[PDB]
Amino acid sequence: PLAAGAVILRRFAFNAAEQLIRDINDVASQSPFRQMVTPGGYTMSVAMTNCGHLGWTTHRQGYLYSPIDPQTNKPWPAMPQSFHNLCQRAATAAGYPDFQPDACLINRYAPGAKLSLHQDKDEPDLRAPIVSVSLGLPAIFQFGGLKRNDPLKRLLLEHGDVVVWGGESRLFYHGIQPLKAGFHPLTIDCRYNLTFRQAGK
Ligand SMILES: O=C(O)C(=O)N[C@@H](CSCc1cccc([N+](=O)[O-])c1)C(=O)O
Numbered sequence: 001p002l003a004a005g006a007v008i009l010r011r012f013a014f015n016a017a018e019q020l021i022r023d024i025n026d027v028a029s030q031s032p033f034r035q036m037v038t039p040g041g042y043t044m045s046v047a048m049t050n051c052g053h054l055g056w057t058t059h060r061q062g063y064l065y066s067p068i069d070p071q072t073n074k075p076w077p078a079m080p081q082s083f084h085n086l087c088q089r090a091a092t093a094a095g096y097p098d099f100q101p102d103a104c105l106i107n108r109y110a111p112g113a114k115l116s117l118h119q120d121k122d123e124p125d126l127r128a129p130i131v132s133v134s135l136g137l138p139a140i141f142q143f144g145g146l147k148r149n150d151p152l153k154r155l156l157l158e159h160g161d162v163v164v165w166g167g168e169s170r171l172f173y174h175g176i177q178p179l180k181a182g183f184h185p186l187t188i189d190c191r192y193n194l195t196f197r198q199a200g201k
């Protein structure tokens with residue numbers, strides 16, 4: 001396959017998108033999007049927030065999952081029903097019926113925003129997949145392999161696409177290329193990505 005252990009489900013979230021986006025807005029009304037600072041001192045171009053019991057954040061110049069939003073000093077908003085349902089349906093179709101995320105990181109891309117190449121290794125159990133849902137403007141996703149120098153492959157992720165990153169692919173280096181400007185009827189001028197994680201012990 002494209003990436004061993006990954007399951008791409010194009011347009012899987014297409015019908016759910018309008019509701020998901022309403023729920024992104026609701027979460028953000030409580031824990032606002034913010035551009036976090038990397039441990040290296042750089043302000044991320046991607047803006048982020050979280051919902052669920054745990055939320056990914058930079059903290060004391062490292063990263064961690066925290067039950068509290070350090071910007072509001074309140075818990076991250078509860079996981080919306082629409083998020084919970086979509087993630088479970090996707091995980092199940094992909095062969096991970098027991099996947100129980102307790103964190104959802106919500107990434108917002110304005111034109112030009114990108115993610116540099118990296119691995120997702122902050123979770124306690126790397127056998128749990130990550131479920132990724134793309135909404136709005138299309139992005140070029142790049143992913144390599146288990147080594148930083150593995151050859152990259154590229155794939156366009158479009159509105160409604162869901163990828164379940166399990167098995168070996170769960171540990172691949174990956175990133176997102178600078179978002180091209182455009183219009184989408186539901187998000188207007190941005191892309192959102194939801195990544196569901198099992199972050200608790
Ligand atoms: O927030 C992040 O760290 C991140 O990368 N977010 C991507 C979606 S998740 C893509 C992903 C997750 C886990 C494994 C692999 N992979 O092996 O390509 C890709 C995004 O904002 O579009």
Ligand SMILES: [Fe+3]
Nearest residue numbers: 118119120174
């Ligand atoms: Fe990642």
